[PDB]
Amino acid sequence: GVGVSTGSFNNQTEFHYLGDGLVQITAHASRLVHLNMPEHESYRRINVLNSEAGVAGQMVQDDAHSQMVTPWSLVDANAWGVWFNPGDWQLITNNMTELNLVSFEQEIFNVVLKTITESATTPPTKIYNNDLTASLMVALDTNNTLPYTPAAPRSETLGFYPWLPTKPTHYRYYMTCTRNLTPPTHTGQAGTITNTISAPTHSDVMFYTIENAVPIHLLRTGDEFSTGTYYFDTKPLKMTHSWQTNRSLGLPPKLATEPTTEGQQHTGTLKAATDREGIHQTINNSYTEATALRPAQVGYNTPYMNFEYSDGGPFLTPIVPVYDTQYNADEPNGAYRITMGYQHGQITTATELGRYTLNPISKGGRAPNQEFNQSSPLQMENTLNGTLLPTDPIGGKTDIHFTNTLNTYGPLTALNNTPPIYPNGQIWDKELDADLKPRLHVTAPFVCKNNPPGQLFVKIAPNLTDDFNADSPQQPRIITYSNFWWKGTLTFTARMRSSNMWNPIHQHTTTNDNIVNYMPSNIGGMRLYPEIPQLIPRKLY
Amino acid sequence: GVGVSTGSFNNQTEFHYLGDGLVQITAHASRLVHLNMPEHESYRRINVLNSEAGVAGQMVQDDAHSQMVTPWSLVDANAWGVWFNPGDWQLITNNMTELNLVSFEQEIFNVVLKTITESATTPPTKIYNNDLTASLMVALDTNNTLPYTPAAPRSETLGFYPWLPTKPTHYRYYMTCTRNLTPPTHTGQAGTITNTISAPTHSDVMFYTIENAVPIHLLRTGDEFSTGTYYFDTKPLKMTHSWQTNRSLGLPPKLATEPTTEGQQHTGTLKAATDREGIHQTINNSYTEATALRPAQVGYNTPYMNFEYSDGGPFLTPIVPVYDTQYNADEPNGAYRITMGYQHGQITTATELGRYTLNPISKGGRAPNQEFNQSSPLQMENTLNGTLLPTDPIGGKTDIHFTNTLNTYGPLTALNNTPPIYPNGQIWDKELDADLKPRLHVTAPFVCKNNPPGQLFVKIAPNLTDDFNADSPQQPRIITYSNFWWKGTLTFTARMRSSNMWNPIHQHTTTNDNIVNYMPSNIGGMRLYPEIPQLIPRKLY
Amino acid sequence: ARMRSSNMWNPIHQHTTTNDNIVNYMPSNIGGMRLYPEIPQLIPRKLY
């Protein structure tokens, strides 16, 4: 029967406080998902090029790839703000040390299929007849047979507002590209560079169609498509950021001259350099605090802005994101620059899209203009030619320092994970099916070792015109759309924090200049400006 | 299935006479509730100001606040005339001493969703296509997570007629306002007053959205949304008004000169003033009847027309409503001035809205031009400067008397509750969640100590146009409406009255000039002019 | 005590720690401590 409802809209985030501190954050989400029909039902391998990199010097501007455009649309839950309004994400940045991840279920219910029909009067008048008999095709890829494409790094998820109706995005995935871009040049001189994408190699062209991979449930207007409860197996995230560094690990040296006056303008003085004792990593006698004996370095000098070049094309090496120094650099420390849409933040007036250059606040980051390197003997009051200051060029290039090439990722390199980004970051991510797994993902903090949860493919079934369908490239169809609700349930599990100290830590407050970032205006303009995550401090040693 | 009915229209008020006098007034109500679609689905915080108070002297005319307009519409039962036609409320003002309150259930059934469609011919012609697949969102706030806003003090309830189809009103609630209106001035002089609403403070901005608070049941055209039977826990109201005053409490003094003639023009004479005896509250020897020994005062001199001023703004102190003196004053006694709509009373011709300045008839009220105050010694034939007559100004203001400032609410102040007002008054009310609860509410006579019954939020689900819904402030929609029935059941419990006296008391009759207030005219014009409540007298001591 | 539950959208005022507030929470070079007050009752609630 059509006139019977099939599901319940639900969006409350139940913080069900279990014993011993553990909580069970059951986060629901429900949005009307307005699906339009596919503009073409034929699968298309669209090679993409650009004339922008074909002129010399614009080789960062490299948009060329080979794209497999499918008519199927993807309903995506893999974004943080779908499940958490800022009132409930304030509760977790204030109070939770760890976040485990447990359950996940999707549900499409209460689909409304409609036929639009044009009448030929003096305005364009469109009549919305109701389809009682048409269907739409859903496909829960319960094995992840298809390439897992999360829409969070493109900000193409469902919109993070409950009342605003969202849109699902077209499923598409990378096909093999064999990129020719060399020679790599400067900007000033002209070169005979070749900017073509070549023919795809035979051994790797990987064409997944949706019909021959996942079984597809047709759904009439009284449907209820229930995904089974996916149980995660992830590492427990740690929301508590670490502040200790290699000038803060271990036991500090004792001081003989201790201050007498109030105010921190006066400083206590240690013992002499050659008179101190302990274990030490160099040859020289004087034990300063810079060259000390620290267990492992936190962070690592990434060779930054380093454009590697693989069969796919030129690409920048992703840096583990970490809190910058007191000098805001953010490029060798891996800043996030997340541009949203008008479903994801961004007060809906006539301006362009908001930006928010972000960082975490886990203090483990370095500065490129603050580092230096020396010769093998230590030699305080060092020789001009024995120490490599960052004023020195590399190969005669004055803007380029040693740290552009210098990598220090040794085995003893402790490192914090990716911060979860709000509301625009990604929640979970597919484990890279490689022989050597990466230790952490920069795209998402939760890593699924098992089969990741099924991405959901939704497409309108072809409602066909009376016209013939043999020996024709493109058929006519009845123009149509859909309005199906979508209910999720993402059950977290988190441990409450315990204050084991004296001074009160930084909590996510609400200032007088902050309520305008949290309240609607006279029009209805909403905004979801980010939250700098990982507020509770913790010790790394 | 759509073509099967789901509920029963029902409106009979069963007076089920139980034993020992108790009755169980089971009052049903059922009205067609015509819901229109929301004009916008975006939440809007609309600050309200007015230029009327910005000029000096109009500072009672203070309409400025900060309003949170939500697209959800509220179906309200909290009004008396929904449940009681005047034939059944005559039965309870004639015969019932107390009214307990027991049960309450709501039910939305038999919804009819329709699409309106415009055709472009020479008149505007509108075609009502039927939606078999669309839905409407209902939300029974079973915990009162949202701010409880009763529509009875704004006369925005369902209309009190069974056959006339009603309308639900848009749910909206007060946001924080920080009002600047000083200096408070007179009317004659001009001042440099500042009339602005300021920026809302950070610590208190309280933005409840409907989706993230209460789980929401989508309902197709064959729905039946049944609220569970809410069981009240209220004080038993007492419909019997009290007439005894401090010139009527206790034992009267005995008289020696008793009258001889027929007719009350001749009066019995008491003993002398200095010769009477008894307990007495002053120092002087003469025991008059004014200064007597009475257990507690009934009523209390409110400082009336007293505009207190809180973070919200200027507001008048609500006075406990009580029967005025023989001199009709009604302002220091808290009159009701209830203006209705054409669904709530008010013969539906071309006139403006009816008024009915009302009072209860519980005799405990005072008059401001009939009171006076004296010095500490009593001193009959009092000194000109020793007694404060209400001809005396306060601070040189001749119209303002001592009683404008004078409060006499002592601990021994007996007081009657709020009269229930018909048909326009409120039935129940939320307990003010404060540390010190108020003793009585002026808005409604029944007080719910527990969680109050769930207010019901109804909104049409978004029926969307083919046009895109990303990166757009305002989307187009199919214009639509709804016709859902709404059945309630408000089970009272009341005790029958017992006449323990000789003379017959005032019952609510029907005079020859009263049937026009109770009967329809040749057009169909109905009216629900009020009933002066609480007719049975009782003793207070 | 009962834990609070956030039943709303916008985040309420919590007792934070600003850059001009750590000097009210940390000892100095002498040993000077301080317990400047906290403005209490931060979570808002409705009275009706």
PDB file of all heavy atoms in Angstrom, chain B residues 12-23:
ATOM      1  N   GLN B  12     -18.597  14.118  22.154  1.00  0.00           N
ATOM      2  CA  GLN B  12     -19.550  14.126  23.258  1.00  0.00           C
ATOM      3  C   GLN B  12     -18.835  14.145  24.597  1.00  0.00           C
ATOM      4  O   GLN B  12     -17.856  13.425  24.806  1.00  0.00           O
ATOM      5  CB  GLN B  12     -20.490  12.929  23.177  1.00  0.00           C
ATOM      6  CG  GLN B  12     -21.512  13.096  22.094  1.00  0.00           C
ATOM      7  CD  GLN B  12     -20.987  12.666  20.757  1.00  0.00           C
ATOM      8  OE1 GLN B  12     -20.221  11.710  20.659  1.00  0.00           O
ATOM      9  NE2 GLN B  12     -21.276  13.458  19.736  1.00  0.00           N
ATOM     10  N   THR B  13     -19.334  14.971  25.506  1.00  0.00           N
ATOM     11  CA  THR B  13     -18.772  15.119  26.839  1.00  0.00           C
ATOM     12  C   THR B  13     -19.564  14.223  27.784  1.00  0.00           C
ATOM     13  O   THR B  13     -20.621  14.618  28.287  1.00  0.00           O
ATOM     14  CB  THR B  13     -18.824  16.579  27.278  1.00  0.00           C
ATOM     15  OG1 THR B  13     -18.178  17.390  26.290  1.00  0.00           O
ATOM     16  CG2 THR B  13     -18.112  16.768  28.601  1.00  0.00           C
ATOM     17  N   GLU B  14     -19.063  13.016  28.014  1.00  0.00           N
ATOM     18  CA  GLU B  14     -19.755  12.028  28.827  1.00  0.00           C
ATOM     19  C   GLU B  14     -19.596  12.376  30.300  1.00  0.00           C
ATOM     20  O   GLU B  14     -18.487  12.314  30.836  1.00  0.00           O
ATOM     21  CB  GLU B  14     -19.204  10.629  28.563  1.00  0.00           C
ATOM     22  CG  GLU B  14     -19.419  10.119  27.156  1.00  0.00           C
ATOM     23  CD  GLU B  14     -18.823   8.741  26.945  1.00  0.00           C
ATOM     24  OE1 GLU B  14     -18.165   8.229  27.875  1.00  0.00           O
ATOM     25  OE2 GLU B  14     -19.005   8.174  25.848  1.00  0.00           O
ATOM     26  N   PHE B  15     -20.694  12.740  30.951  1.00  0.00           N
ATOM     27  CA  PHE B  15     -20.705  12.912  32.398  1.00  0.00           C
ATOM     28  C   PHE B  15     -21.043  11.569  33.021  1.00  0.00           C
ATOM     29  O   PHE B  15     -22.214  11.253  33.236  1.00  0.00           O
ATOM     30  CB  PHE B  15     -21.706  13.980  32.820  1.00  0.00           C
ATOM     31  CG  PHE B  15     -21.317  15.355  32.406  1.00  0.00           C
ATOM     32  CD1 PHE B  15     -21.852  15.925  31.268  1.00  0.00           C
ATOM     33  CD2 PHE B  15     -20.407  16.078  33.147  1.00  0.00           C
ATOM     34  CE1 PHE B  15     -21.489  17.196  30.879  1.00  0.00           C
ATOM     35  CE2 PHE B  15     -20.038  17.348  32.763  1.00  0.00           C
ATOM     36  CZ  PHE B  15     -20.581  17.908  31.629  1.00  0.00           C
ATOM     37  N   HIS B  16     -20.024  10.783  33.311  1.00  0.00           N
ATOM     38  CA  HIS B  16     -20.198   9.428  33.811  1.00  0.00           C
ATOM     39  C   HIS B  16     -20.227   9.515  35.330  1.00  0.00           C
ATOM     40  O   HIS B  16     -19.179   9.598  35.973  1.00  0.00           O
ATOM     41  CB  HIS B  16     -19.080   8.526  33.302  1.00  0.00           C
ATOM     42  CG  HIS B  16     -19.298   7.075  33.582  1.00  0.00           C
ATOM     43  ND1 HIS B  16     -18.873   6.470  34.745  1.00  0.00           N
ATOM     44  CD2 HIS B  16     -19.901   6.108  32.851  1.00  0.00           C
ATOM     45  CE1 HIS B  16     -19.201   5.190  34.716  1.00  0.00           C
ATOM     46  NE2 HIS B  16     -19.826   4.946  33.579  1.00  0.00           N
ATOM     47  N   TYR B  17     -21.429   9.513  35.896  1.00  0.00           N
ATOM     48  CA  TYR B  17     -21.627   9.690  37.334  1.00  0.00           C
ATOM     49  C   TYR B  17     -21.146   8.451  38.075  1.00  0.00           C
ATOM     50  O   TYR B  17     -21.778   7.397  38.023  1.00  0.00           O
ATOM     51  CB  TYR B  17     -23.095   9.962  37.636  1.00  0.00           C
ATOM     52  CG  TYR B  17     -23.589  11.304  37.159  1.00  0.00           C
ATOM     53  CD1 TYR B  17     -24.202  11.441  35.922  1.00  0.00           C
ATOM     54  CD2 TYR B  17     -23.433  12.436  37.941  1.00  0.00           C
ATOM     55  CE1 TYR B  17     -24.652  12.671  35.481  1.00  0.00           C
ATOM     56  CE2 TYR B  17     -23.877  13.668  37.510  1.00  0.00           C
ATOM     57  CZ  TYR B  17     -24.485  13.779  36.280  1.00  0.00           C
ATOM     58  OH  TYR B  17     -24.929  15.006  35.851  1.00  0.00           O
ATOM     59  N   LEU B  18     -20.021   8.575  38.770  1.00  0.00           N
ATOM     60  CA  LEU B  18     -19.556   7.521  39.655  1.00  0.00           C
ATOM     61  C   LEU B  18     -20.271   7.613  40.999  1.00  0.00           C
ATOM     62  O   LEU B  18     -21.198   8.404  41.191  1.00  0.00           O
ATOM     63  CB  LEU B  18     -18.044   7.596  39.842  1.00  0.00           C
ATOM     64  CG  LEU B  18     -17.120   6.878  38.856  1.00  0.00           C
ATOM     65  CD1 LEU B  18     -17.086   7.534  37.497  1.00  0.00           C
ATOM     66  CD2 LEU B  18     -15.722   6.818  39.434  1.00  0.00           C
ATOM     67  N   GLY B  19     -19.828   6.799  41.949  1.00  0.00           N
ATOM     68  CA  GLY B  19     -20.448   6.767  43.254  1.00  0.00           C
ATOM     69  C   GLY B  19     -20.110   7.985  44.090  1.00  0.00           C
ATOM     70  O   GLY B  19     -19.314   8.839  43.699  1.00  0.00           O
ATOM     71  N   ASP B  20     -20.677   7.991  45.292  1.00  0.00           N
ATOM     72  CA  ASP B  20     -20.437   9.004  46.314  1.00  0.00           C
ATOM     73  C   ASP B  20     -20.328  10.435  45.833  1.00  0.00           C
ATOM     74  O   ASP B  20     -19.749  11.277  46.516  1.00  0.00           O
ATOM     75  CB  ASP B  20     -19.153   8.651  47.051  1.00  0.00           C
ATOM     76  CG  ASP B  20     -18.156   7.958  46.153  1.00  0.00           C
ATOM     77  OD1 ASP B  20     -18.525   7.662  44.997  1.00  0.00           O
ATOM     78  OD2 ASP B  20     -17.015   7.712  46.597  1.00  0.00           O
ATOM     79  N   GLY B  21     -20.872  10.722  44.664  1.00  0.00           N
ATOM     80  CA  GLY B  21     -20.813  12.074  44.159  1.00  0.00           C
ATOM     81  C   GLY B  21     -19.764  12.262  43.094  1.00  0.00           C
ATOM     82  O   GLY B  21     -20.014  12.933  42.100  1.00  0.00           O
ATOM     83  N   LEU B  22     -18.586  11.679  43.275  1.00  0.00           N
ATOM     84  CA  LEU B  22     -17.582  11.873  42.240  1.00  0.00           C
ATOM     85  C   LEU B  22     -18.179  11.630  40.864  1.00  0.00           C
ATOM     86  O   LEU B  22     -18.994  10.723  40.680  1.00  0.00           O
ATOM     87  CB  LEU B  22     -16.407  10.926  42.459  1.00  0.00           C
ATOM     88  CG  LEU B  22     -15.617  11.089  43.753  1.00  0.00           C
ATOM     89  CD1 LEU B  22     -14.608   9.968  43.867  1.00  0.00           C
ATOM     90  CD2 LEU B  22     -14.933  12.441  43.813  1.00  0.00           C
ATOM     91  N   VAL B  23     -17.778  12.450  39.896  1.00  0.00           N
ATOM     92  CA  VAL B  23     -18.089  12.208  38.496  1.00  0.00           C
ATOM     93  C   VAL B  23     -16.774  12.056  37.751  1.00  0.00           C
ATOM     94  O   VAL B  23     -15.698  12.296  38.293  1.00  0.00           O
ATOM     95  CB  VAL B  23     -18.937  13.326  37.868  1.00  0.00           C
ATOM     96  CG1 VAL B  23     -20.151  13.603  38.707  1.00  0.00           C
ATOM     97  CG2 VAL B  23     -18.126  14.566  37.684  1.00  0.00           C
TER      98      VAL B  23
END
